[PDB]
């Protein structure tokens with residue numbers, strides 16, 4: 085009945101616990117000590133961190149809880165506006181934009197994105213096959229090049245041309261600094277950086293003046309409910325939203341996937357063997373990517389251990405009781421600590437920290453709400469299928485074309501922004517000399 | 521593009537008289553030894569291809585290219601199992617409903633509710649064995665069938681077959697075990713007495729199920745999920761006709777293949793004393809209470825490996841059938857047209873030396889220490905894909921609980937030096953397998 089709570093810092097309460105460069109991993113350690121639920125207090129704020137499937141499946145009851153904007157999302161809202169990810173469910177523009185943009189993430193839409201995904205994936209393979217002997221790969225940096233370019237091309241027919249650069253694009257230079265101010269919360273840079281983004285979004289809009297992409301549905305798509313299309317201001321927020329949401333969590337997944345592969349050679353061989361027998365053409369087709377089952381299992385197990393969007397927030401729609409012993413009042417917050425939920429020994433067994441993609445051969449074997457890397461309910465990730473198709477294509481192409489070596493025997497160091505990434509992860513790729 | 525081998529033919533009967541034998545799975549295994557990874561098998565009105573290598577079977581398990589086919593054996597079982605889960609086609613509406621309605625009752629979480637009743641039946645087995653007089657022996661497959669039938673009856677439907685109080689098995693299964701016999705005999709096959717008996721058999725099995733369905737305060741069991749469960753997709757519950765078919769289906773599928781596994785597991789243990797001692801040592805240090813708990817059974821890792829290795833050599837459901845959803849090519853050299861059949865010869869697949877090495881015939885549970893070490897689709901005792909065994913974990917929990925309790929409570933002796941004689945129905949079992957058990961005098 086009484087909720088545990090970590091150590092306090094006087095009038096600052098629990099807030100200095102987050103004054104660290106790895107806040108998610110610190111919260112995981114607290115969850116290891118205090119268990120499935122603990123209170124977290126800050127000046128002006130109270131929330132509860134859930135970490136067990138037993139409590140989180142109740143929090144995922146959409147009749148009792150709705151998506152809440154965490155403090156991290158409130159700061160992203162200062163430039164993402166009422167885009168899909170930083171709007172409340174009751175805001176008119178959420179459901180409107182939701183109804184207009186859901187078709188562009190359908191299976192018929194994924195078939196149309198596929199050619200442009202392969203375009204960027206080929207650029208990645210050719211960069212690696214053009215390396216000299218004893219040169220290494222900076223994995224998360226190259227994966228960020230790929231995912232940013234994919235969403236730019238597939239979504240808006242804009243070429244960031246990240247593989248022609250050392251220093252990333254001027255647009256995201258503002259982003260990582262603007263997102264830095266958001267996570268760290270200099271105010272001059274934030275305002276000057278926010279303008280830089282709107283200036284790109286203008287170039288992307290003016291240039292569209294054909295195509296079958298996200299940007300088309302935003303200018304021409306009409307919400308069946310209200311009959312209205314999106315107004316100019318909201319489209320600009322969606323572009324910013326999709327540029328951000330569309331790349332960084334996907335590049336973390338690919339980076340973590342390759343990390344776990346080179347640390348588990350038995351899993352690597354099974355995935356490489358599948359890639360070899362399935363990807364028989366010089367360019368993978370859409371149907372061939374759907375056939376990479378074990379590769380998809382690899383990606384899901386990487387998302388289990390290190391889900392790159394590591395939390396989401398909920399609030400109680402009415403007075404209710406959680407787990408039969410924790411009464412909540414209307415408006416109270418919850419935080420779903422996804423990495424801890426995915427380490428629930430009562431769901432996954434004792435080998436939670438081991439990388440075994442074989443857990444995911446049967447999706448029906450996994451209990452309800454035990455696996456939530458993409459959020460929950462109507463506010464779940466709209467880009468899930470985009471993300472998994474791109475990552476499966478790219479990982480399959482990587483496994484087909486190269487043998488990989490953990491030549492520094494890398495020690496996992498997870499850098500935390502609002503997402504997770506293995507920092508300093510480097511490998512060597514020995515080409516298999518299979519032409520494209 | 522290669523031409524497919526084929527065994528000897530019998531004129532207009534083609535290959536069919538090859539199955540006119542009392543050990544057809546072992547006969548098909550011998551043909552696979554002669555002809556290799558694939559061979560065509562023809563019968564009047566029927567053609568299928570038997571796969572035996574991981575190389576081809578890993579392709580056949582691609583669900584975008586192949587779907588479950590009802591073999592001639594499953595078609596005959598359908599005459600009384602109806603559109604139950606095991607004898608329905610994937611596109612039949614009642615498959616996906618019953619599948620969506622019944623998966624929760626087979627979840628790893630769900631076993632915790634079955635566990636007490638599994639222990640109920642397992643204690644009766646231990647107490648029967650410690651109550652034997654000196655120099656009395658155990659009839660292993662007979663007692664394992666007593667246990668598994670009672671477990672599925674109790675855990676699934678709160679019905680007590682009370683097999684450990686009987687010499688002659690239950691009247692229901694006498695019809696059931698005879699119905700599977702007549703169905704099996706029809707493949708190899710004036711027969712009016714066979715058809716009169718068959719319908720009378722369906723009547724005994726049905727009327728018993730309608731006793732419970734008509735008879736049945738709620739419960740944890742399967743039957744509760746069937747009467748109250750609603751398909752999340754269509755919102756509909758099962759109709760009464762399908763429910764009875766599921767009961768018949770689960771009564772059959774729930775016990776017969778599981779008792780063969782336990783029988784084969786105990787056979788291999790007493791033929792490999794070093795493995796038995798290693799398994800017995802784990803049982804002792806883990807089963808520290810008079811009654812095993814759910815957690816402790818989960819901790820019997822080596823026992824689970826023992827059961828997996830028994831399933832490798834003699835998978836008690838020895839085959840399953842597939843059909844090509846579209847024109848495709850198997851292995852780059854065998855073209856298949858839409859609708860063509862395959863048969864997966866599971867015991868032969870599990871003897872692929874390119875997967876397991878040259879010691880394929882040796883009982884070594886350590887092969888299953890790492891699941892990530894096993895190549896894809898090399899181990900298929902429970903079928904494939906969405907049409908895989910729904911009761912897989914029920915079976916493995918029951919067998920692990922029962923086998924661990926046996927190894928904790930008795931030392932076993934192969935006092936006749938039993939020669940393995942595998943009886944074939946639609947499943948496999950070691951016939952005539954008998955042992956002596958010296959109680960260790962550990963109370964319950």
Ligand code: HEM
Pocket residue numbers: 151168169170182235325326329330331333334335337391392393395396397457458459460462463464465466467468470471472
């Ligand atoms: C690759 C791995 C990805 C992960 C782990 C991930 C994670 C998540 C999570 C957890 C949420 C729910 C956040 C919340 O409930 O507060 C979410 C929402 C969202 N994601 Fe992703 N995402 C991924 C890929 C993508 C991609 C590729 C796109 C764009 C194409 C995208 C666009 C969005 C959008 C628009 C939302 C908001 C949906 C809504 O509010 O209705 N995501 N994502």
Ligand code: HEM
Pocket residue numbers: 588605606607619769770773774775777778781835836837839840841900901902903904906907908909910911912914915
């Ligand atoms: C060691 C024990 C067992 C083995 C080796 C085994 C084997 C198999 C195999 C190979 C299949 C696929 C058949 C096919 O594809 O045609 C299957 C399906 C099935 N099994 Fe089992 N089984 C076992 C135990 C059980 C138990 C205990 C139950 C019931 C609780 C059960 C119920 C079923 C059902 C209902 C199906 C059909 C599932 C569907 O098609 O959706 N089995 N089993």
Ligand SMILES: O=C(CCCCCn1ccnc1)N[C@@H](Cc1ccccc1)C(=O)O
Pocket residue numbers: 102124126129131154155156157333393394395396419502503
């Ligand atoms: O735990 C987290 C991390 C959640 C960020 C996920 C962002 N993302 C990115 C893509 N899709 C979602 N954030 C808390 C920290 C906090 C708690 C209490 C008081 C102050 C701060 C919060 O911001 O509320």
Ligand SMILES: O=C(CCCCCn1ccnc1)N[C@@H](Cc1ccccc1)C(=O)O
Pocket residue numbers: 539544561563566568591592593594707777837838839840863946947
């Ligand atoms: O022998 C078998 C073995 C099938 C038994 C599997 C039944 N089971 C029981 C529980 N789980 C599965 N299958 C073929 C034989 C045949 C080949 C060619 C022509 C006619 C018959 C078939 O029945 O089609």
Ligand SMILES: C=Cc1ccccc1
Pocket residue numbers: 161162165166
């Ligand atoms: C709170 C920030 C905001 C952003 C866009 C529209 C309305 C409000």
Ligand SMILES: C=Cc1ccccc1
Pocket residue numbers: 150173174401
């Ligand atoms: C979840 C929907 C909602 C709608 C209006 C107010 C609060 C919540």
Ligand SMILES: C=Cc1ccccc1
Pocket residue numbers: 222225249250
């Ligand atoms: C990280 C810098 C860089 C520079 C050139 C090619 C690839 C990477």
